[PDB]
Amino acid sequence: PFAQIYILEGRTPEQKKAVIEKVTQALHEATDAKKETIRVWIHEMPKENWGIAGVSAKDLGRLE
Amino acid sequence: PFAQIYILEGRTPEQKKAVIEKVTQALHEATDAKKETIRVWIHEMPKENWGIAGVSAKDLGRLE
Amino acid sequence: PFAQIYILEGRTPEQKKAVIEKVTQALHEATDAKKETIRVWIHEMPKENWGIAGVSAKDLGRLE
Amino acid sequence: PFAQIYILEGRTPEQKKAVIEKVTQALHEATDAKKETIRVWIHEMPKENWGIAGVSAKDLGRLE
Amino acid sequence: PFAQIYILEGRTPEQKKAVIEKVTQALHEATDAKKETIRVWIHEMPKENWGIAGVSAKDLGRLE
Amino acid sequence: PFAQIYILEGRTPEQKKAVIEKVTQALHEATDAKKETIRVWIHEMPKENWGIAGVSAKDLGRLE
Known part of the structure; x- marks a missing residue:
């Protein structure tokens, strides 16, 4: 699996390692697949490149 | 996030619900993102459509 | 581009044709790319395979 | 939805904002989904990483 | 890698096996990656779900 | 098609051009699709962003 x-750009390397670790464990537990078979990779998206309801994460980050 | x-075709609906639940929790814990923002979707691939080292999951399933 | x-399963063929038409027009207008170059394809996801905040579209569809 | x-690298930020805006509107009109649910994100591909009929956008950009 | x-729906199983075999070999030769590491999977898209210049493969299939 | x-970051431009060329040829031969229709694009993943059995390519690169 x-x-x-x-994810958006700007997360710590510790958070990205945790994504790999916890998602891999999540798939192992949900499907019982051998960890050897599991692959997880991460695209980091610029905030200008990430739209939520037609508004970019960048424009939202300017607001409270 | x-x-x-x-995943390959043939997994139980309980396993697919667990994929959604555990992967969502994994992303929440790894990034501290609000669960409201997290989305997880699942493509189920036919065994004929899934290649490992040039051999399909289907041909492998014939073997021990 | x-x-x-x-999208979730269950939409009309007219809506899917409109997705292809309007998204293609949207990319043409936003980037000025020739329509000849634009490609749009649609994955229809089973409601069991679509997680929102850890809950599947299927379980949500049971509710009001 | x-x-x-x-898209290829090299487009203006205005064009990328327009991609987010117009594609979101296109999906809203084609499916009648609430804009709150719609998400659009953009991968910007290096011209060396984009093949058309076996030739990269980079090699093509050298030509007329 | x-x-x-x-691909569009409607291709023979022999063609899909060849996709897995030849793409795997192509990646092995282009990158020198061990075949053990290479994975290739195939999404088969309904013709209604595949847009070329704003027109679906289905509407095109009606024409000559 | x-x-x-x-692929992981760090491959030569010659290898990436070969990916485009050989994968395009592989799809042409496997499906008999006209090369004009074939598109291949390449995401280069940071080693920190690529998980194998729960361990990142970066941590693995430190080892023998």
């Missing part, structure tokens, strides 16, 4: 993860 | 999951 | 669209 | 957009 | 392949 | 390729 494979997981393709999409 | 979003997770696009690829 | 290419668009990979993810 | 979600849209994963693939 | 991983390859995610998108 | 389209191929979305995922």
Whole structure:
């Protein structure tokens, strides 16, 4: 089982390692697949490239 | 944060619900993102459509 | 420019044709790319395979 | 409904904001989904990483 | 190295096995990656779900 | 037919051109699709962003 993860830019390397570790464990427990077979990779998206209801994460970050 | 999951066909609905639940929890804990923002969806791939080292999961399933 | 669209199962064929038409027009107008170059394809996801905040679209559809 | 957009590097930020805005509107009109649910994100591909009929956008950009 | 392949519905199983075999060999030769590490999977898209310049493969299939 | 390729960062430009060329040829031969229709694009993943059995390519690169 494979997981393709999409996150915004700006997260710590510790958080990205945890994404790999916890998502891999999550797939192992949910499907009982051998960890050897599990692959997880992470796309880091610029805030200008991430739209929520038609507004970019960048424009939202300017607000409270 | 979003997770696009690829699994082979043939898993129970309980396993697929667990994929959604555990991967969502994994992303929440790894990034501290609000669960409201997290999305996880699952592509179920036919065994004929899944290649490992040039051999399909289907041809492998014939073997021990 | 290419668009990979993810929607839930259960939409009319007219809505899917409109997705192809309107997304193609949207990319043409936003980037001025020739329509000849634009490609849009649609993955229809089972409601059991679509997680929102850890809950599947299927379990949500049972509710009001 | 979600849209994963693939464009070549080198487009203005105004064009990328327009991609987010117009694709979101396109999905809203085609499916009648609430804008709150719609997500659009953009991968910007290096010209060396984009093949058309076996030739990269980079090699093509050298030509007329 | 991983390859995610998108083809229209309607191809023979022999063609899909060849996709897995030849794409795997192509990645092995281009990158010198061990075949053990290479993964290739195939999404088969309904013709109604595949847009070329704003027109679906289905509407095109009606024409000559 | 389209191929979305995922490789680790750090490969030569010659290898990436070969990916585009050989994968395009592989799809042409496997499906008999006209080369004009074939598209191949390449995501280069940071080693920190690529998990194998729960361990990142980066941590593995430290080892023998």
